[PDB]
Structure formats: C-alpha cells, structure tokens
C-alpha cells in the first residue's frame, strides 16, 4: 500500500486495522488522525489489495 497525506499534513507520502496501528505510532500524525477522513483509491470510505493507495484528508475549505 501507499499512504498519501493531503493539504496541511507535513508528513511525506510513503510505501509501508493494521494500517491504523502503524499510523497511530507516527507522531507527526497525532494532530491529524482524529479529524482526517480517508479515501481508498480516490474514494471516501467510512478489504485491501496490492497497489492500493490510501489518502488522508484533513478538514476542507474551498472557495
């Protein structure tokens, strides 16, 4: 899997329920996991496979 971080999040994208625990141990993400929504392959969710890309989306403000 690839993990990408959109908007304000500082962390660089990388390639490393068992996705939660690992992101939950990165400290640059403690600010974020409480408020971020997640897209699996460009689709918001609320299964996994090879080459799946998981995207973290902080609160938005278009306009």
């Amino acid at each position: 899997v690839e993990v990408r971080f959109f908007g304000p999040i500082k962390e660089e994208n990388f390639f490393i329920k068992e996705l939660r625990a690992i992101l939950q141990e990165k400290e640059g993400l403690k600010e974020w996991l409480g408020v971020c929504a997640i897209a699996l392959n460009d689709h918001l969710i609320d299964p996994l496979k090879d080459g799946d890309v998981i995207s973290l989306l902080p609160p938005v403000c278009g306009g």
């Binding site: 304000p8 460009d42 995207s55 989306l57 609160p59 403000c61 278009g62 306009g63």
Partner: protein, 145 residues
C-alpha cells in the same frame, strides 16, 4: 470543460463571457453565477489553495450529472496555488431553460461545495502559508482511524 482547475487567479472576465455565450447558444433563459473573491483580512497578502484533483473531479461530476438530469448546466472553476487580494479563486454557473431548477441547484451546490469539496485553504502572511484550521470542515468519515 465542466471543471476547470487554474493555476493562480481566475480570469473571471473570460470565464463569464464563455459561459454566457454557451447560455445563448443553448437558448437558455436563466443564468446564475457565483464568484468567490479573495478579500483583505488583517494584512494578509492573499490565499493559497491545495486541491485533491482526482477526487474533486469525481465529486463534481456527480453534481454536473445531477444538474443535467434537471435540464441545468452546472460548471465551475477554481484556483490552485496563490491568489492575491482582490482576485477571484472560485466561480460557478448554473444555467438552464427555467430559473427554478437553476436557482435550486445553485444554492444546493454551493453549500455542498463549501463542506465537501476536497480543497485546502491557507492564509498568505509574510510569504508563508498558514492553514485555516478554525474555519475548516471535517469530511464525511472524519476520524476513521
């Protein structure tokens, strides 16, 4: 195109002209426009935007097609990157034969857009971007992890 992502400030003159010409060519009778303009707050230089383009495209395509089913053409444009004070960062049009559906989609779209379009806003101060956390809106399914 249905969705336009523009680097920097929108050329609202050019966009409005093109949209109107379309309105006339399609024999439309109602034309609703919204323009979001960067205003000077405190002493900011302007705003800056990041966009999740793939998701923005799909999200918007659902609105465009919901509009089309009702006889309404709905299109939008939005800036990417820096937009200075006085410049436009967002524009949308809802137009059609009759005002009723066009006006209803316009209202409904703009409200959904504010809360759901995957776009991130920063204040430009001292040549630095400051994320606008307090003013921002959690996406559906926030705090999943």
């Amino acid at each position: 195109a249905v969705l336009k992502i523009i680097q920097g400030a929108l050329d609202t003159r050019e966009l409005l002209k093109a949209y109107q010409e379309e309105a006339c060519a399609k024999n439309f009778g109602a034309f609703c426009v919204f323009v979001g303009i960067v205003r000077k707050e405190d002493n900011i230089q302007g705003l800056s935007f990041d966009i999740y383009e793939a998701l923005l495209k799909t999200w918007f395509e659902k609105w465009h097609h919901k509009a089309k089913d009702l006889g309404v053409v709905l299109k939008m444009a939005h800036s990417l990157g820096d937009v200075l004070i006085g410049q436009s960062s967002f524009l949308c049009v809802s137009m059609g034969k009759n005002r009723k559906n066009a006006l209803e989609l316009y209202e409904n779209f703009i409200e959904d857009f504010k809360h759901n379009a995957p776009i991130w806003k920063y204040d430009l101060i001292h040549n630095k971007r400051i994320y606008a956390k307090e003013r921002s809106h959690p996406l559906k399914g926030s705090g999943l992890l």
